[PDB]
Design a protein. Structure first.
Ligand code: HEM
Ligand SMILES: [N+]
Ligand SMILES: [N+]
Ligand SMILES: [N+]
Ligand SMILES: [N+]
Ligand SMILES: [N+]
Length: 153
């Protein structure tokens, strides 16, 4: 569940994201929606948005971008001991929002793309390797909770 050395690479990278949570959140959701159109359909609140331009202009979308990264920052900071925060999130995405585990992987990919575009020099292969493992650990712990509830798939 990651070495201390890899957790460090991740939070160093995340300290950086914190500088503009709003910009990064807006970019991550627009990229998830562009590459995987089906995920956009899961948000009643953003369906209306067709083009990239419209997505960018939506303040509400940017607001949501902040919610998501604030919650993910709370998880990552726990350095694996994130059960209290992951629980309510796993439960609401399974039973309320109805988000397949496959969409969590798609967003994990989105996150990586944005952190590489932005912070080119701070996100070397080594930081990307540690970041990948953190997201996968989050994804495994969610899927465990999904199964218990009868929504793994
Ligand atoms: C990095 C992973 C994600 C995190 C940390 C995250 C976080 C959150 C949080 C904190 C909320 C607010 C309330 C609640 O869930 O009880 C929320 C709402 C929601 N999430 Fe996520 N989310 C993630 C990924 C996803 C994905 C990938 C989708 C869609 C494919 C999605 C679908 C939704 C929807 C539809 C809502 C409700 C929006 C509303 O109508 O208020 N989530 N998310
Ligand atoms: N490893
Ligand atoms: N916003
Ligand atoms: N964990
Ligand atoms: N929500
Ligand atoms: N790096």
């Amino acid at each position: 569940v990651l070495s201390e050395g890899e957790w460090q690479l991740v939070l160093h990278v995340w300290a950086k994201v914190e500088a503009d949570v709003a910009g990064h959140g807006q970019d991550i959701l627009i990229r998830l929606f562009k590459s995987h159109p089906e995920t956009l359909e899961k948000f009643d609140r953003f369906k209306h948005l067709k083009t990239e331009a419209e997505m960018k202009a939506s303040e509400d979308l940017k607001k949501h971008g902040v919610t998501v990264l604030t919650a993910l920052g709370a998880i990552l900071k726990k350095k694996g001991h994130h059960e209290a925060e992951l629980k309510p999130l796993a439960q609401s995405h399974a039973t309320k929002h109805k988000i397949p585990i496959k969409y969590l992987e798609f967003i994990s990919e989105a996150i990586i793309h944005v952190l590489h575009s932005r912070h080119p020099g701070d996100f070397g292969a080594d930081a990307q390797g540690a970041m990948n493992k953190a997201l996968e650990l989050f994804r495994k712990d969610i899927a465990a909770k999904y199964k218990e509830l009868g929504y793994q798939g």
